[PDB]
Structures are given as C-alpha cells and as structure tokens.
Amino acid sequence: SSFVEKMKKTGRNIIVFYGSQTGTAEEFANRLSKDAHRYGMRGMSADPEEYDLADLSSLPEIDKSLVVFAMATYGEGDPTCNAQDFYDWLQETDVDLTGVKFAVFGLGNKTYEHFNAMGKYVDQRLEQLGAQRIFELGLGDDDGNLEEDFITWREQFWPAVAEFFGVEATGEESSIRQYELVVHEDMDVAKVYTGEMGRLKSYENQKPPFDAKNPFLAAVTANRKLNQGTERHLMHLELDISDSKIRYESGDHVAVYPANDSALVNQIGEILGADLDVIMSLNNLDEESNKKHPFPTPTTYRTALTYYLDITNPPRTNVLYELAQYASEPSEQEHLHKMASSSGEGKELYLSWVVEARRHILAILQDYPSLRPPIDHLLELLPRLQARYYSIASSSKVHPNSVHITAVAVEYEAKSGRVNKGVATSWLRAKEPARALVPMFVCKSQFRLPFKSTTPVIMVGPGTGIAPFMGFIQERAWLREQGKEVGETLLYYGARRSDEDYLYREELARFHKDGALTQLNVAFSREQAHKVYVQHLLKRDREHLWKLIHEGGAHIYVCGDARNMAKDVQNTFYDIVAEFGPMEHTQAVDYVKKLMTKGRYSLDVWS
Ligand SMILES: Cc1cc2nc3c(=O)[nH]c(=O)nc-3n(C[C@H](O)[C@H](O)[C@H](O)COP(=O)(O)OP(=O)(O)OC[C@H]3O[C@@H](n4cnc5c(N)ncnc54)[C@H](O)[C@@H]3O)c2cc1C
Ligand SMILES: NC(=O)c1ccc[n+]([C@@H]2O[C@H](COP(=O)([O-])OP(=O)(O)OC[C@H]3O[C@@H](n4cnc5c(N)ncnc54)[C@H](OP(=O)(O)O)[C@@H]3O)[C@@H](O)[C@H]2O)c1
Ligand SMILES: Cc1cc2nc3c(=O)[nH]c(=O)nc-3n(C[C@H](O)[C@H](O)[C@H](O)COP(=O)(O)O)c2cc1C
C-alpha cells in the first residue's frame, strides 16, 4: 500500500502522480510514465489519493528514483479533488525529504486569477522539505495551447533527467499501438466487467468505504422538474446514501459516473461495422508497462463505449493524426492531417471546425466516409469518461442520508450542424424513482459555513448556482430550531423570468417567513427591457452589506462562473468598500482580497 514498495515490486524507478479532475493531467502523467522506457528506465503513473505521500520519505531507498507531479489547478487555486489529501498533508508536515528528486508540471489557465497555484505550491513546498529539484517547474496554459506547452517542456525534461541518472535515449523504434486486441470465445459472465470503475463486481457488492475508485450506487428517490417554463429543463434530484457510511456537509460536491446515450453508442458501432457485443480485452504490447489495460477488461465494446470512454467531446489533434492513416480517400486524409498540424492555419481549421463547432467522434466518422478504422484501435485512442461534479444542495444536519442535486439539462445545437446532449445530465434526467441507481462519491470542499453560528452570511448564487445555498439555509434554519443563535442570512439569487425558471420559490418563501432567510433578494434578467443581476441588488444594499462586512464580520459566498459573474460581483464589492471605507479603489481591492485570504470570501467556481 506504499507506492514506494509498489515501485520496488515492479522495478519502477520513476513515479508520476496526477492531480487531475477531467483527465488532462492524468493523460500527461500516463505519457510521461511511458517515456521512461525510451531511456532504459521504468515508471508508472498513479493517483496520489490511493496512496500516502508521506511515503516520499522512503523513495531514497530505490537507486536513481524520481517522483514527477502533473497537477491541475481549480477554483481559487485549490487542488483537484484527488489531490486534497496530499495537499492537506503538504501543509501539515515537516518531514525531511533530503535524497528525494522531483519535477513538477502544472496545468493551469492564465485567464483565472490564481494561475497554476497548485503546481507552484508543490514545486515550492517540496523544495522547503529538503527534496532536490532536477528540472524546472513547467507552467502549462490551457488559454493558449496546453498540449504544446507540455511537449516543449517534456522535450527538455527527458534530456536533463537522462543526463542526471547516467542513461540515454535507447533509440527504440516505437510501436504506434500501445495495446493489442484479444477476443474471448467463452468468458464467464461474472468474469466480464459490465461498467464498474474498479474491483470487479464492486458495483453489485457494495462494500464501504466508498470513494472515487469504489463509488456507491445510490438510488434516486426523487427527480422533478423545477422550472415552470419549457425553454430549458431544470431538475432536482435526491439520492439515498443510507447505509453507505458516507458523510457530507453543506458546500461539498457529489460526483457521479454517467452512461453515454445508448443511441450514440449504437451508431458508432454501426458506422464501424462492429459487433458491440463481442466480449474482449486490450493488452499492453509492452509487457513491462504498469498500465496493463486502457480500462477494465475483459468487457464488451458496448460497455467500454458506454461507461469507460469519452465519445462526446471534441477529438484531440492526436486522435485525428492517428485516424488519418485510415482514410481511403487522399483529400480526406490530407484534411485530417491539416487539422492535426502545427501550422498556424492548420491549428485554426481545428479550433474552428472541430473544437468550436463541437464535433465528436461520430460526427467525424460521418464527415469522413473513407475513414474506416478498426474499432479496437479506436477504443485505445479515446479518453476515459470522467465523473461530473455537482454542488450538494442539502444539509447533512437535516438530510444525513440524502444528497440533493440541482442541475440544468444540457442540450444545444452545435455549429457542427447536429444536436449535442450532455452526458451526465441526460443520464440523470432519465432516472425515474420507479431502482434507478447513480454511482457516486463525495468530495469535500472548503466552501463551509462559518465556524461560529453567529457570523452573518452573504450568499450570491445566480441560476442553478443557488444549489449549495439551499444547503446553507436548511442548515441555518435547523441551527435556529436548535435554540442556537444565528447571524443574518442573506441570499442574492437571479433568474431569467419569474414565470420561467425561478427556482425553489416555495421552499424559499417558507425559509423567509420562518426567519431562517433574513432577506431574499431576487433579480430577473429578462423580465423587462432592463437586465438585472445580483450585483445590482448588492449595490442597492450597499449600506447594510458594508455594515455586516466591516462590523458584523460577515462571510461572503459566490457560486458559479469565476471569470465573469464572480468577477463582476468581486468588482461590485470593491466599489462598495471604496465608497464606505472610504478608500481608493486600490485599497478597496486589498481589503476584499484580504477577506479571501482571511477566509471570509469563498468562491465555488463551476467554470
Ligand atoms: C466544482 C463544480 C461544481 C459544479 N456544480 C454544478 C451544479 O450544482 N449544477 C449543475 O447543473 N452543474 C454543475 N457543474 C457543471 C457540472 O459538473 C456539469 O459539467 C454540467 O452539468 C454538464 O455536464 P454534462 O455531462 O451533462 O455535459 P457534458 O456532456 O459534459 O458537456 C458540457 C460541455 O458542453 C459545452 N456546452 C454546453 N452548452 C453549450 C452551448 N450552448 N454551446 C456550445 N457548447 C456548449 C461546454 O464546452 C461544456 O463544458 C459543476 C462543475 C464543477 C467543476
Ligand atoms: N459566464 C457567466 O457569467 C455565466 C452566467 C450564467 C450562466 N452561464 C453558463 O450557462 C449555462 C446555464 O447556467 P444557469 O442555468 O445556471 O444560468 P442562467 O439560467 O443563465 O442564470 C444565471 C443568471 O445570471 C445572469 N448573468 C449572466 N451573466 C452574468 C454576470 N456576468 N454576472 C451576474 N449575472 C449574470 C443571467 O442572465 P442572462 O442569461 O439573461 O444574461 C441569469 O439571470 C451554464 O452551464 C453556465 O456555464 C455563464
Ligand atoms: C472550474 C474550473 C476552474 C479552474 N480554475 C483554475 C485556476 O484557478 N487556475 C488555473 O491556473 N487554472 C484553472 N483551471 C484550468 C485547469 O487547471 C486546466 O483546464 C487543466 O488543464 C485541467 O486539467 P484536468 O483535466 O487534469 O483536471 C480551471 C478549470 C475549470 C474547469
């Protein structure tokens, strides 16, 4: 259970941990692990949450050992979910890491405020604990071209590492295919994966504790339309976690593993002219690699495409390059290569015709008829299907055995020319209580209510971003009912039209009437020529809010989009503080930002 011991038992001298939430860092970690072999070394990629990083202290036992970290940065600079434990540990510990060699590559995006905060932290932190840095901190930027940044980093990285441990490029040929196909003639039905994420049968034989690798299948006890209109579809779900031993608090997130639209799976099978019901397995050509399979096997093709692979997002340039070899028509083959190019115009065609038009693997297979790749090679080229995160909309103080979700079904007309459907939400919208089971696990956040119940709370969450706040309110109403003394509880919510998508009208009225909700400020962006947003309302309450912040010591919470809405709200607060301090804008910014570091201004960013 010690990654170090895991390394010794398989001759690995290089370990690459991935701090990832949607797979990018995971895949970079996988590619770097594979790389080690091109230099006569051996590595493995691993999820830090499945291990204890304090074990780094033992890494020096393996000669010429290296630990690499591919870390993504999320909301307010916090780490991804699978890296929180490692991150918490790095802050607690003072372990001496002399003898440890590391390298960090961080995934980020310059348009957010805390650019690669997680990557900079691990790199800086590990040096203070005494470990030795052998290659510079890579700073990838998903705003420009992340893959490109990774490549130019990696190309200097291996040479420096090879120069450090005394080896050199083996000069191997390569293999193209990292896996080979093996079809099964019989197979015991209970020896074949049917969608589980980890241990075989782990879905049928629910056995705690339940986490990311061992999700708990909760039954859907409620699923109802929340919006009055029909322009869009907003839903409220309730999953029973009774007997799961799962604990949660208001502000936490619940992640679910969805299933792709079976009609989409079918079509891909037909277009490839394949038997989606063939039970098979994909094995790593290199029998020395730690990644034996691309996903759980054996399994049918149907299962893989349904529960294990991303078939709805835009195909990566690499996929287009590989697929290219399968276009029996020259002009289509040339177009596929151009979209994979590095040329400026070649990178544009891609950005425009694939990424922005939101074309998926099936659309590409239809738009390029001469393209007929064997399904097994296709499955190896596609990325793993990721879990979708939702802000728990209930309080464990009141619903200890039920996790509530507030979500908007995703469905739009892509510029590709067809209608795209969101995976998790479509799958969730079809679950009818009649037992509909959703695989899920909980992920803690730092979006918690004040430590002391007396501290006033100011919530700003337009649209479905109100979700976590229903939790906060339930809990505050409960605290009051327990004879506790609670500070003021204000909610600033917004919607399109009151008769269209106003959420939780009744529940919100009840809380207000009962005094659990002190003020209920609602803005409607489309019910008039003039658009009204939560920040206009905050501006109208400039006196009171400033009082609660400068005197009451209120806590502020904002939920939704960070770079725009959350940005306008922050600006609005800068203005309020500048007027009532009174102080210069410059000084108002330090004051609002001091609140954040001080822990009183929390942001839960969804995008
Ligand atoms: C910490 C966190 C908390 C979250 N909490 C919630 C929550 O409480 N409620 C909720 O509803 N969601 C929440 N989300 C968003 C949520 O995780 C899902 O991404 C969302 O529900 C859609 O998932 P899907 O699988 O249905 O869509 P997918 O199949 O994953 O597709 C989503 C993608 O489609 C694209 N897209 C969407 N609409 C359009 C359009 N009109 N035109 C072009 N492209 C488009 C975008 O690139 C988008 O990323 C949260 C995200 C994070 C990171
Ligand atoms: N970047 C953003 O600021 C932003 C805001 C809302 C939604 N979205 C996206 O759209 C999808 C629908 O989400 P939803 O249903 O929960 O939201 P929604 O239905 O659009 O509701 C959010 C509310 O915020 C308003 N709004 C828009 N830009 C804003 C800003 N900068 N500051 C404050 N309020 C703003 C909206 O008005 P109008 O729509 O009438 O302009 C609306 O009344 C989501 O998947 C999300 O990614 C993005
Ligand atoms: C909700 C959300 C919040 C993000 N917040 C930040 C951030 O604060 N700073 C940053 O540098 N990058 C931020 N990013 C960008 C990601 O770090 C980048 O897209 C990374 O590649 C994702 O990697 P993954 O697939 O391995 O999780 C954010 C992305 C999302 C989706």
Curated annotation (Swiss-Prot):
Organism phylogeny: Eukaryota, Metazoa, Chordata, Craniata, Vertebrata
Family affiliation: Belongs to the NADPH--cytochrome P450 reductase family.
Binding residues for FAD: R358, R388, Y389, Y390, S391, T406, A407, V408, Y412, G422, V423, A424, T425, W606
Listed InterPro entries: CysJ-like_FAD-binding (IPR003097), FAD-bd_FR_type (IPR017927), Flavdoxin-like (IPR001094), Flavodoxin/NO_synth (IPR008254), Flavoprot_Pyr_Nucl_cyt_Rdtase (IPR001709), Flavoprotein-like_sf (IPR029039), FNR_nucleotide-bd (IPR039261), NADPH_Cyt_P450_Rdtase_alpha (IPR023173)
Sites where the protein binds NADP(+): R232, T464, S525, R526, K531, V532, Y533, V534, Q535, D568
Residue intervals annotated with topology Cytoplasmic: 1-607
Protein name as catalogued: NADPH--cytochrome P450 reductase
Gene Ontology molecular function, alphabetical: cytochrome-b5 reductase activity, acting on NAD(P)H; electron transfer activity; enzyme binding; flavin adenine dinucleotide binding; FMN binding; hydrolase activity; iron-cytochrome-c reductase activity; NADP binding
Cofactor: FAD; FMN
Residue span(s) of domain Flavodoxin-like: 14-158
FAD-binding FR-type domain boundaries: 213-450
Keyword terms of this UniProt record: Acetylation, Endoplasmic reticulum, FAD, Flavoprotein, FMN, Membrane, NADP, Oxidoreductase, Transmembrane, Transmembrane helix
This enzyme's EC code(s): 1.6.2.4
Organism of this sequence: Rattus norvegicus
Binding positions for FMN per the UniProt entry: 20-25, 72-75, 107-116, 142
Broad EC category: oxidoreductase
Single GO biological process annotation from the record: positive regulation of growth plate cartilage chondrocyte proliferation
Catalyses which reaction(s): 2 oxidized [cytochrome P450] + NADPH = 2 reduced [cytochrome P450] + NADP(+) + H(+)
Cell compartment(s), UniProt: Endoplasmic reticulum membrane
Family matches, as PROSITE patterns: FAD_FR, FLAVODOXIN_LIKE
Membrane topology label: Single-pass membrane protein
HAMAP family: NCPR (MF_03212)
Task of the protein: This enzyme is required for electron transfer from NADP to cytochrome P450 in microsomes. It can also provide electron transfer to heme oxygenase and cytochrome B5.
Cellular component annotations (GO), alphabetically ordered: cytosol; endoplasmic reticulum membrane; intracellular membrane-bounded organelle
Cofactor note: Binds 1 FAD per monomer.
Gene3D superfamilies reported in the protein's UniProt record: 3.40.50.360, NADPH-cytochrome p450 Reductase, Chain A, domain 3 (1.20.990.10), Nucleotide-binding domain of ferredoxin-NADP reductase (FNR) module (3.40.50.80), Translation factors (2.40.30.10)
